[PDB]
């Protein structure tokens, strides 16, 4: 009953969860899609609401991965949208290897492997706007190892490949290790709960510089596009919303969305660590979860305040989308509207109040 | 034999000359187009090579404009892509008024008026990225007067309107008062002629900041789009290539295109005036024109070194293209390729060697 069969590795992820939604849409290219969804944790109740076949599997475990993925003979497309959570090149490589060694010898109709890395490929720095043809930096980066494995395995087995390097992701998953919007929404939620203004903790430059990002749905569209369009086969491809923004403008919108007052960047002041400010807010979040009858999340799991700290001390990281556009991909998002869209969606899904 | 009849006011201009080419293409929306081309100077020999009906007319002269434009009964679309060359609000307004008072009472099939202004509407400043809904600055700007005239005249006479605010234009016209690419090509040409490196004269920030621009052909496409598409009627619309660049990268490409060595921005050094450096190069340019058998241009007419000086002390002027994209306009250009395209085209047309 299916035309294509997808293996989404990291289905609970910030992009994986989007693929779980987009792939199942009736007019999605390559459809109708059958979707295998792989993650380490037991299937979340909110993901059980989706028509995907969830496979709980520790992908870093070769024998377990072989055991659970080798019976899947009908897979045609692999979407690797995971990482182990550390910068370890070897343990990250093992995960991707295990996926490949378990599926390739068992899926006689396998066609394409989508590999998701990121713009960190460009600065670990190269100057921006980042273009896909920029050579690797002379450092260790697990993105490098993943690429080399991709080239080696797809070539020997007559498979097409695509490398996707998304910018900062605007998404809705509460299970992501790096979800900036959920992180800021939690921070805003705690501020309103304690009757405090939304105080910008970041640096001056990050407040005022041009920044870019990518909607999680657009990444999914981009990866599906490369999975079905011949023009995008065997290509390295950046992926962002196609525009630029400033955190100063996002911050104001975030404050309005939560109906609280805002304290923007103050001249002379240095950046403060959000990870430190929120260090002891675990019980407060538990109270908010209960009172608002939200989907039960741990503060540590829905928010990554350390990740916001890095974003708020970064600049000059704009990536170019010209290559994808010249290849025919005309997908885009208004980044300001995308950010608001993610807030509404996480409220919708009762991840945040 | 024509479906639409265009009045291009400023046909020798950096955008007007592009309209003269694009409108006459067979698959251009609204085609086949008849094109009236209006400018003050006698018709250039290179413009006589185009199938447009040239009308030499001083548009600031009401009686002359009435005399030459009132017999044109068949006009359906007006493309105002001119200005007088000064910031004078009244003399600029008179030009636009004279066009309207001469055509509207005489063109019974008039439908739409395209008004081209620019991003100067946003800083004369507002913060960027500039969006079309930003209110007018509390200053005198002839863009304001042109808009008010547009609203007033189109409303009373049941006409649709469109306001186009292009970014810095990458074009090919040698008759433009503000052509940055021709200006830099002339500078590069003189450098190679005097056996000197392409020394960057601008500021540090302009060398290193994100910048945007718009291809002259894309502006034409954008204005034609608004002229034929209902979704774009009665809208204020930005127009850029849809990406960003840095002058540091453009400068390197410019040096390669002319086969000469480059001296980029040097730390500690202040900006130098190009208008001063090139002040006495008129005869040198005449020599280059003769030796290379180029189309006869005066240094003052093909180059605007004062304009490059302003561009090389500017920053934070990025404009947003989201509105046009959300309205269905998916036209774009790779700015780096667009810049190279303009160089090749001016060499093609023998404006530069
Ligand atoms: N997030 C961003 O903003 C962003 C932006 C640009 C690029 N990237 C890059 O995109 C890539 C994908 O990261 P992401 O941010 O999409 O990840 P994410 O949202 O944090 O999700 C990671 C997914 O991988 C799964 N996973 C982790 N370890 C596993 C294991 N041992 N076995 C099975 N599944 C495992 C997780 O499930 P469990 O939770 O059950 O383990 C989760 O579903 C990364 O390389 C990242 O650097 C991310
Ligand atoms: N150039 C850019 O980079 C740029 C970027 C953004 C916005 N803009 C804006 O776009 C608008 C159009 O300017 P542009 O740069 O396209 O102009 P341009 O390339 O300098 O050409 C101006 C045109 O207007 C004609 N003109 C001037 N005075 C006239 C008169 N009295 N009677 C008849 N024709 C006359 C000129 O013909 P003659 O030479 O024969 O007089 C010329 O064809 C301006 O408001 C400008 O601010 C320009």
DSSP labels for B184-208?
HHHHHHHHHHTT--EE--S-HHHHH
Which is nearest to A7 in space by CA: A106, A134, A88, A143?
A106
Whether residue B75 contacts residue B111, with contact meaning beta carbons closer than 8 Å, is answered with no
**Experimental method, per PDB record:** X-ray
Mutate to test the interface with A, among B130, B265, B325, B333 (most CBs of A within 10 A): B325
What is the SS3 assignment for B133? Answer: coil
Place of tokens 């403060």: A272
How many whole angstroms separate alpha carbon B341 and alpha carbon A127?
23
Whether residue B41 contacts residue B9, with contact meaning beta carbons closer than 8 Å, is answered with no
How many whole angstroms separate alpha carbon A136 and alpha carbon B246?
21
The pair of structure tokens assigned to A277 is 């400010």
Which is nearest to A167 in space by CA: A212, A137, A123?
A212
How many whole angstroms separate alpha carbon A214 and alpha carbon A142?
21
Pairing verdict, β A112-116 and A160-166: parallel
How many whole angstroms separate alpha carbon A20 and alpha carbon A13?
10
Q: Are residues A129 and B318, on separate chains, in Cβ contact within 8 Å? A: no
Whether residue B222 contacts residue B329, with contact meaning beta carbons closer than 8 Å, is answered with yes
Mutate to test the interface with B, among A247, A264, A320, A331 (most CBs of B within 10 A): A320
Residue count (chain B): 353
The span from the first CA to the last CA of chain B, in angstroms, equals: 39
Whether residue A262 contacts residue A252, with contact meaning beta carbons closer than 8 Å, is answered with yes
- Burial tier of B88 (Cβ tally within 10 Å: 0-12, 13-18, 19+): middle
Which is nearest to B220 in space by CA: B65, B19, B11?
B19
DSSP labels for B136-148?
PPSS--HHHHHHH
Whether residue A345 contacts residue A258, with contact meaning beta carbons closer than 8 Å, is answered with no
Which is nearest to A96 in space by CA: A108, A77, A83?
A83
Cα A40 to chain centroid distance, Å, stands at: 16
* Residue B156 annotated to the active site: no
How many whole angstroms separate alpha carbon B5 and alpha carbon B33?
6
The pair of structure tokens assigned to A221 is 């569209």
CA distances from B276 to B268, B279, B309 (A): 20, 5, 10
Minimum CA–CA partner of A337 in chain B? B322
- Burial tier of B173 (Cβ tally within 10 Å: 0-12, 13-18, 19+): buried
How many whole angstroms separate alpha carbon A17 and alpha carbon A25?
13
How many whole angstroms separate alpha carbon A241 and alpha carbon A215?
6
β-sheet bridge partners, residue A306: none
DSSP summary character for residue B211: B
Is A321's Cβ below 8 Å from some Cβ in B? yes
Q: How distant is the Cα of A335 from the closest Cα of chain B, in angstroms?
A: 9
How many whole angstroms separate alpha carbon B190 and alpha carbon B185?
9
**All residues at 6 or more sequence positions from A348 whose CB lies less than 8 Å from its CB, including other chains:** none
Is A330's Cβ below 8 Å from some Cβ in B? yes
**All residues at 6 or more sequence positions from B88 whose CB lies less than 8 Å from its CB, including other chains:** B142
What is the SS3 assignment for B123? Answer: coil
Domains contained in chain B, CATH given: 1-353 (3.40.50.720)
Sign for the pseudo-dihedral over CA of B123, B126, B127, B131:
negative
Ramachandran bin of A350, using left for φ above 0, alpha for ψ from -120 to 50, beta for the remaining angles: left
Rounded to 5 degrees, what are φ and ψ at A149? -65, -40
Place of tokens 């007033």: B152
The pair of structure tokens assigned to B199 is 């020394």
Residue count (chain A): 353
How many whole angstroms separate alpha carbon B350 and alpha carbon B207?
29
What is the SS3 assignment for A160? Answer: strand
Whether residue B107 contacts residue B72, with contact meaning beta carbons closer than 8 Å, is answered with yes
Peptide bond into A32 cis (omega under 30): yes
Which is nearest to B308 in space by CA: B271, B268, B347, B341?
B271
What is the SS3 assignment for B238? Answer: strand
Peptide bond into B334 cis (omega under 30): no
Q: What is the resolution of this structure in A?
A: 2.1
**How many DSSP H helices and E strands does chain B contain?**
14, 11
Output the known binding site of A for substrate: 120, 143, 314
Whether residue B83 contacts residue B103, with contact meaning beta carbons closer than 8 Å, is answered with no
Q: Are residues B242 and A210, on separate chains, in Cβ contact within 8 Å? A: no
**All residues at 6 or more sequence positions from A148 whose CB lies less than 8 Å from its CB, including other chains:** none
Whether residue B245 contacts residue B172, with contact meaning beta carbons closer than 8 Å, is answered with no
Rounded to 5 degrees, what are φ and ψ at A106? -120, -20
Residue closest by Cα to atom 41 of ligand 1: A40
Place of tokens 């959300």: B326
Output the CA B176–ligand 2 centroid distance in Å: 7
- Helix (H), strand (E), coil (C) string for A262-322: EECCCCCCCCCCHHHHCCCCHHHHHHHHHHCCCCCCCHHHHCCHHHHHHHCCCCCCCECCH
The span from the first CA to the last CA of chain A, in angstroms, equals: 39
Catalytically annotated residue among A122, A143, A187, A200 = A143
Residue closest by Cα to atom 3 of ligand 2: B169
Cα A239 to chain centroid distance, Å, stands at: 11
Whether residue B242 contacts residue B321, with contact meaning beta carbons closer than 8 Å, is answered with yes
Is B334's Cβ below 8 Å from some Cβ in A? yes
Q: How open is the CA angle B134-B137-B138, to the nearest 5 degrees? A: 145
- Name the helix (H) or strand (E) containing B318: none
The pair of structure tokens assigned to A273 is 């660590």
How many whole angstroms separate alpha carbon A134 and alpha carbon A155?
22
How many whole angstroms separate alpha carbon A168 and alpha carbon A120?
10
Q: How open is the CA angle B84-B5-B144, to the nearest 5 degrees? A: 35
- Burial tier of B31 (Cβ tally within 10 Å: 0-12, 13-18, 19+): middle
**All residues at 6 or more sequence positions from A24 whose CB lies less than 8 Å from its CB, including other chains:** A33, A35, A50, A51, A52
Catalytically annotated residue among B36, B54, B122, B143 = B143
How many whole angstroms separate alpha carbon A350 and alpha carbon B12?
59
Provide the chain A residues 286-305 that lie in CB contact (below 8 A) with chain B: none
- Burial tier of B199 (Cβ tally within 10 Å: 0-12, 13-18, 19+): middle
How many whole angstroms separate alpha carbon B173 and alpha carbon B15?
8
Minimum CA–CA partner of B129 in chain A? A245
CA distances from A50 to A18, A76, A324 (A): 11, 20, 30
Whether residue B315 contacts residue B209, with contact meaning beta carbons closer than 8 Å, is answered with yes
- Name the helix (H) or strand (E) containing B65: helix B62-69
- Burial tier of B1 (Cβ tally within 10 Å: 0-12, 13-18, 19+): exposed
Of A210, A245, A334, the CB nearest to B326: A334
What is the SS3 assignment for B156? Answer: helix
Inter-chain contacts counted by CB atoms under 8 A, chains A and B: 46
The pair of structure tokens assigned to B243 is 């990406």
Q: How distant is the Cα of A295 from the closest Cα of chain B, in angstroms?
A: 34
* Residue A97 annotated to the active site: no
Which ligand sits nearest to residue B82's alpha carbon? 2
Rounded to 5 degrees, what are φ and ψ at A94? -60, -45
DSSP labels for B41-56?
SPPPTTTTTSSSEEEE
Is B125's Cβ below 8 Å from some Cβ in A? no
Which ligand sits nearest to residue B84's alpha carbon? 2
Q: How open is the CA angle B139-B149-B79, to the nearest 5 degrees? A: 110
Q: Are residues B243 and A129, on separate chains, in Cβ contact within 8 Å? A: yes
Is B345's Cβ below 8 Å from some Cβ in A? no
Output the CA A287–ligand 1 centroid distance in Å: 28
The pair of structure tokens assigned to B342 is 């303009």
Q: Are residues A243 and B322, on separate chains, in Cβ contact within 8 Å? A: yes
Which is nearest to A164 in space by CA: A98, A219, A125, A213?
A219
Whether residue B176 contacts residue B303, with contact meaning beta carbons closer than 8 Å, is answered with no
Q: Is the CB of A83 under 6 A from ligand 1?
A: yes
Query: Which atom number of ligand 1 is nearest to the Cα of residue A58?
Result: 32
Ligand 2 binding pocket (C-beta < 6 A) is B 10-16, 39-41, 57-60, 81-84, 95, 116-118, 166, 168-169, 173, 175-178
Whether residue B28 contacts residue B22, with contact meaning beta carbons closer than 8 Å, is answered with yes
DSSP summary character for residue A129: S
What is the SS3 assignment for A115? Answer: strand
Strand intervals (E) in A81-239: 112-116, 160-166, 168-170, 198-199, 213-215, 235-239
Q: Which of B9, B10, B164 to probe ligand 2 with, by most ligand atoms within 8 A of CB?
A: B10
DSSP summary character for residue A245: B
Output the known binding site of A for NADP(+): 12-14, 40-41, 58-59, 82-83, 116, 143, 169, 176-178
Q: Are residues A325 and B242, on separate chains, in Cβ contact within 8 Å? A: yes
How many whole angstroms separate alpha carbon A317 and alpha carbon A144?
19
**All residues at 6 or more sequence positions from B78 whose CB lies less than 8 Å from its CB, including other chains:** B6, B7, B9, B99, B100, B103, B110, B112, B113, B114
Instruction: Give contacts of A129 with chain B, Cβ < 8 Å.
Output: 210, 243-246
Taking the CA of residue A186 as centre, how many other CA atoms within 13 Å lie in the half-sphere pointing to its CB?
A: 33
Whether residue A101 contacts residue A62, with contact meaning beta carbons closer than 8 Å, is answered with yes
Q: Gaps after which residues in chain A, C–N over 2.5 Å?
A: 124
DSSP labels for B329-341?
------HHHHHHH
Whether residue A177 contacts residue A304, with contact meaning beta carbons closer than 8 Å, is answered with yes
The pair of structure tokens assigned to A242 is 């196609």
| Helix, strand, coil % in chain A, rounded to nearest 5 | 40, 15, 45
């Amino acid at each position: 009953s299916y035309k294509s069969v997808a293996l989404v590795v990291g289905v609970t992820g910030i992009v994986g969860s989007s693929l779980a939604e987009v792939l199942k849409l009736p007019d999605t290219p390559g459809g109708p899609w059958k979707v295998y969804g792989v993650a380490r944790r037991p299937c979340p109740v909110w993901l059980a609401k989706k028509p995907v076949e969830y496979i709980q599997c520790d992908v870093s475990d070769n024998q377990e991965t072989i055991s659970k993925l080798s019976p899947l003979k009908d897979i045609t497309h692999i979407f690797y949208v995971s990482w182990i959570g550390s910068e370890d090149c070897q343990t990250n490589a093992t995960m991707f290897k295990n996926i490949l060694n378990s599926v390739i010898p068992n899926a006689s109709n396998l066609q394409h492997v989508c590999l998701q890395t990121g713009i960190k490929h460009y600065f670990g720095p190269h100057d921006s706007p980042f273009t896909e043809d920029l050579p690797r930096l002379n450092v260790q980066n697990f993105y490098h190892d993943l690429e080399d494995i991709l080239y080696e395995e797809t070539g020997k087995n007559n498979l097409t490949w695509s490398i996707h390097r998304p910018a900062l992701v605007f998404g809705f998953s509460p299970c992501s290790m790096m979800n900036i919007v959920s992180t800021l929404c939690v921070y805003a939620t705690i501020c309103k709960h304690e009757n405090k203004a939304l105080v910008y903790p970041g640096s001056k430059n990050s407040w005022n510089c041009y920044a870019d990002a990518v909607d999680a749905d657009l990444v999914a569209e981009h990866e599906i596009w490369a999975a079905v369009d011949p023009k995008a086969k065997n290509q390295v491809l950046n992926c962002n919303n196609g525009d630029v923004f400033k955190w100063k403008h996002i911050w104001k919108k975030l404050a309005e969305e939560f109906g609280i007052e805002m304290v923007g960047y103050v001249e002379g002041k240095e950046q403060v660590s959000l990870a430190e400010l929120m260090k002891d807010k675990d019980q407060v979040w538990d109270e908010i979860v209960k009172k608002n009858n939200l989907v039960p999340t741990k503060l540590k799991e829905i928010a990554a305040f350390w990740f916001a700290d890095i974003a708020f001390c970064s600049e000059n990281l704009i990536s170019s989308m010209n290559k994808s556009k010249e290849l025919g991909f005309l997908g885009f998002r208004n980044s300001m509207k995308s950010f608001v869209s993610c807030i509404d969606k996480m409220r919708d899904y009762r991840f945040i109040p």
